[PDB]
Write a protein that binds this DNA or RNA. Structure first.
Ligand SMILES: Cc1nnc(C(=O)NC(C)(C)c2nc(C(=O)NCc3ccc(F)cc3)c(O)c(=O)n2C)o1
Ligand SMILES: Cc1nnc(C(=O)NC(C)(C)c2nc(C(=O)NCc3ccc(F)cc3)c(O)c(=O)n2C)o1
Ligand SMILES: [Mn+2]
Ligand SMILES: [Mn+2]
Ligand SMILES: [Mn+2]
Ligand SMILES: [Mn+2]
Ligand SMILES: [Mn+2]
Ligand SMILES: [Mn+2]
Ligand SMILES: [N+]
Ligand SMILES: [N+]
Ligand SMILES: [Zn+2]
Ligand SMILES: [Zn+2]
Lengths: 365, 163, 365, 163
DNA sequence: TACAAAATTCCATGACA
DNA sequence: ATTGTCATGGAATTTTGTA
DNA sequence: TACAAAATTCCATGACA
DNA sequence: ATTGTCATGGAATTTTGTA
């Protein structure tokens, strides 16, 4: 082939002179620092790299190290990497070595009832025939409503929320994509009332994080109230609700209740500071506090993170991976970038999916 | 003295009996003395028992310093009397047949009764499912004094359902 | 009480003068920057702090913030913290805010067969009636043996290992405290052969980490070999075994097989570099390589870590916490400190337990 | 030439039939040409089939360049012939009735036969469970040349079971 | 223009299926 | 089509009562 | 005594029930 | 009575072929 010229002492791009290139057993051999290696004809080299790789479906360095034993040619790795990009198997099974970008800290809703966050807790031990708790948190104040249910169902969610909205109607309800909230029956209940439904990306509880974080505090306090006793939580819910709604956030120096009403009710240790102000004076002082609330900023990027660029080869993690089956879906493309942490992708194949980076890896190579 | 505030005093009373809806018969009416904010609770009887169950709900949100009521059997009972002492609520009673309560409350308390009969007739059997809508309407309705909805006085912001 | 003196203008330790201390409704009140607060008599103050705390079983700041509303006395927090230490409930339910110390990187075994690490994988999909794989890794070389089993049982473990030890006998076998290896039947099998059994602390797979990390690589390669096909792994095991034993660790620049034998067998891409050395020359070159192997050091301590001191109040995490029940056991004491990461504790109550810090929190207060 | 190495050549042969143990009848004997390291595999018949199953085990550890054997039906068959080509093993055959193999191997191959009859008698029925102990003994036994156990030559370290 | 020690604020760590 | 949150308790920093 | 670009080494990230 | 490990692929650092 093109190796012909080389044995005859003539130069080629790559193939550095100073090494003697000889012939043995009808193969083109070369003396190198590392030792004497064989140089395959261009047309054999893909076939070689593949054979080596397919032994254990090894990465760049592991593959090259096998090939190094027998062969040499110019730009060995460039070729190896060309293969690692085409191994359908390695791409959908290997995990990522790139962390996703810094999280986002969306702003506090401005007014109470601007946005509700909901979620179901459970199943729990049966009390009084009930198994789940519906937790509703006001995004602004952190004020929380609890409702015992027998199942995490659309029907029961509606029953509960009808009671709640007797007090006021929210602009927006944010939920996970759990069966209870995605149903058409709910969607309409919500439209009937002029409430916008909003859902977090699939398999990302962190988005419903404001409720989730209240779940923690609920389960924790119930646990504490039930040490010793049999797990009879039903009758405790009210107490928990109250207790938690009147608990100071050390960062804010305010109980949710305070942020919702601007005065403490007839609770234990009710703060009197505003006892002298008319309701009006008080009410605007409250309106001030609400705006001047502490708000976190996003954290520094981890040193090896990635951000999603439009038209990027990107892969979605498998829902519920089966035993011994690939942890990732085939490659798919970034359609739009909703924010540095949420992406729309044309998937398998193909529907627009809204997804969180945390469920994505960049296709490598 | 010290100016009046929400949760200072809760006025309670029973409306009923009404035509049965979902097997309910009575409405327990709770108006907040200062704001005029209203809660409505359907009950099966004007009994201490049903009062307690209902007020347990409301008192998961807030606890008044004072509850005012007529001398109806339900509120005079020693069980209700104990219920309130437990939660540190002082109980207040109008004298028999001379029902003294706030100017603002009498009016709101009248509105409820009208608004109930109004949308009761035509569907006298399905007033239970309507209670949310009623409560919402009442609480978001401009008082001639203040030009504020009870909603506004309680929360110090605007509702997303005006009237 | 002792508050008598104060109303009369005389000084007391704490109780700073410059504020006027007056009497109202038979209570001792005080005018302060924050406002006018009540000062309880010494004997009431524990009762006060407890009442506040017991509302939501809140921490230091949350508790104090309630009390601040109504009361003032000197060194308020000191008292609050005294309570947080005695709330049996908060201690066994709250999580830690202190990370455990930097991990340790024990040294490579010196010789092959110095130490075997074992573990069971499974259950898997049934192939040929088998459900689990017994994975044995040589600590020194990383060389691995695989054995299909129908159950993760003592009896089957013995059967497998009898075959393996036909080749050579190890000094030590390290395992997790899984039923199969803790049994008396195994313990004797092992003593019969003069093999020391050694077990990692309870619920700390990281200790069996050398095998665990091989499990990853096994499951990964099997997954890759089974994309498309039905999960027929039984007949694949041999291939995997070979493939993995002849895979270069990029850090070492050596396949396990090489470290075990010092020469490549008749494998694809078998390295020829030592083809000229007598067995002897080769054998000692190998003996050199083994000692000069790359060995990691422990990582920097995380900024808020803790180390176990002898006689420290320390608590063990619950095995399999029930629903709504405390995530931690009652306080217990550090008996000896085996290493900065392993502790012996007198538990509940009381038996000597060997435990990893990762399953411990320091009792706070 | 190039000095001799482990895995260069594997000598294989069948010993049997023996008194049945655990329903096994034959022992397939694999000695490594250079080190003298020995594997023993119990089989139910001196058949290509049982040879393949056995050698599949051994070849999970290492693959020889060459296998040498007598012209027994099991090794001459085309199935064995294909098995070896697949794994890239060249096959080598002694001529009939003149069994040429290594000086070192003949001796080791003799030792096995003696050591088998020795501890066979007295428990002729329970030789299966003993195969590990035998293999271990053989491989950790000092050769008069080298003063090295096959174990030492293979692994370049000392075993924790000397003899 | 100053000190020791209380009182406050900072913030990593962990957990909400 | 959307997005993490925040109680907790030592450490670290600021404010306080007295000169 | 110096360059561009290949070849190597570094190392955070993730997952082994 | 004991204890984390290490393939992976971009980045970062070193070595290389030529002056
Ligand atoms: C579509 C679609 N199909 N399935 C899902 C899905 O998300 N499923 C899981 C099992 C993960 C889930 N989890 C939680 C939850 O709270 N988990 C714990 C947690 C909370 C916070 C935090 F930061 C990390 C973890 C739910 O509430 C919940 O409803 N689901 C369904 O979405
Ligand atoms: C006593 C006693 N009772 N129960 C345990 C116990 O440890 N149980 C678990 C379920 C945790 C377990 N896990 C693994 C495993 O490999 N897990 C995954 C992993 C591997 C490495 C790493 F760093 C983190 C996680 C096992 O092999 C195993 O046998 N077990 C029993 O000990
Ligand atoms: Mn949910
Ligand atoms: Mn949840
Ligand atoms: Mn009445
Ligand atoms: Mn295990
Ligand atoms: Mn394991
Ligand atoms: Mn024969
Ligand atoms: N936002
Ligand atoms: N060690
Ligand atoms: Zn591959
Ligand atoms: Zn507590």
């Amino acid at each position: 082939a093109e190796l012909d010229q080389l044995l005859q002492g003539h130069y080629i791009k790559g193939y550095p002179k100073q090494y003697t290139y000889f012939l043995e057993d009808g193969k083109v051999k070369v003396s190198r620092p590392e030792g004497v290696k064989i140089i395959p004809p261009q047309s054999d080299r893909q076939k070689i790299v593949l054979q080596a790789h397919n032994l254990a479906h090894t990465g760049r360095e592991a593959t090259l190290l096998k090939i190094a034993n027998l062969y040499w040619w110019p730009n060995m790795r460039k070729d190896v990497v060309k293969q690692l990009g085409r191994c359908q198997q390695c791409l959908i099974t290997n995990a990522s070595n790139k962390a996703s970008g810094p999280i986002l800290r969306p702003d506090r809703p401005q007014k109470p009832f601007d946005k509700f966050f909901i979620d179901y807790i459970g199943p729990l031990p049966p009390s009084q025939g009930y198994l789940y708790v519906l937790v509703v948190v006001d995004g602004m104040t952190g004020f929380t409503w609890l409702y015992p249910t027998k199942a995490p169902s659309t029907s029961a969610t509606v029953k509960s929320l009808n009671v709640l909205t007797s007090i006021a109607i929210p602009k927006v309800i944010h939920s996970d994509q759990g069966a209870a909230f995605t149903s058409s029956t709910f969607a309409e209940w919500a439209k009937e009332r002029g409430i916008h439904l909003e859902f977090s990306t699939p398999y990302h509880p962190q988005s419903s994080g404001k409720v989730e974080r209240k779940n923690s505090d609920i389960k924790r306090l119930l646990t504490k109230l039930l040490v010793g006793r049999p797990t009879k939580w039903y009758d405790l819910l009210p107490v928990v609700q109250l207790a938690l709604n009147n608990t100071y956030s050390p960062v804010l120096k305010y109980t949710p209740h305070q942020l919702l009403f601007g005065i403490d009710s007839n609770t234990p240790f009710a703060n009197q500071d505003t006892l002298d102000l008319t309701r009006e004076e008080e009410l605007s002082l409250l309106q001030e506090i609400r705006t001047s609330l502490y708000h976190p900023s996003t954290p520094p990027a981890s040193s090896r993170s990635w951000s999603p660029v439009v038209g990027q080869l990107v892969q979605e993690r498998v829902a519920r991976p089966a035993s011994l089956r690939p942890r990732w879906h085939k490659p798919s493309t970034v359609l739009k970038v909703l924010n540095p942490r949420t992406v729309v992708i044309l998937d398998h194949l193909g529907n627009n999916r809204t997804v969180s980076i945390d469920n994505l890896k960049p296709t490598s190579h | 003295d010290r100016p009046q505030k929400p949760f200072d005093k809760f006025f309670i009373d029973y409306i009923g009996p009404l035509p049965p809806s979902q097997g309910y018969l009575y409405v327990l009416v709770v108006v907040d003395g200062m704001t005029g904010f209203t809660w409505l609770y359907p009950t099966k009887a004007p009994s201490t028992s049903a009062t307690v169950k209902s007020l347990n709900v409301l008192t998961s949100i807030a606890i008044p310093k004072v509850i005012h009521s007529d001398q109806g059997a339900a509120f005079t009972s020693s069980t209700f009397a104990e219920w309130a002492k437990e939660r540190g609520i002082h109980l207040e009673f109008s004298t028999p047949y001379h029902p003294q309560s706030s100017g603002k409350v009498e009016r709101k308390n009248s509105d409820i009764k009208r608004l109930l009969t109004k949308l009761l007739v035509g569907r006298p059997t399905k007033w239970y499912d309507l209670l949310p809508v009623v409560q919402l309407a009442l609480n978001n309705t401009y008082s001639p004094v203040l030009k504020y909805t009870p909603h506004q006085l309680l929360f110090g912001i605007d509702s997303n359902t005006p009237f």
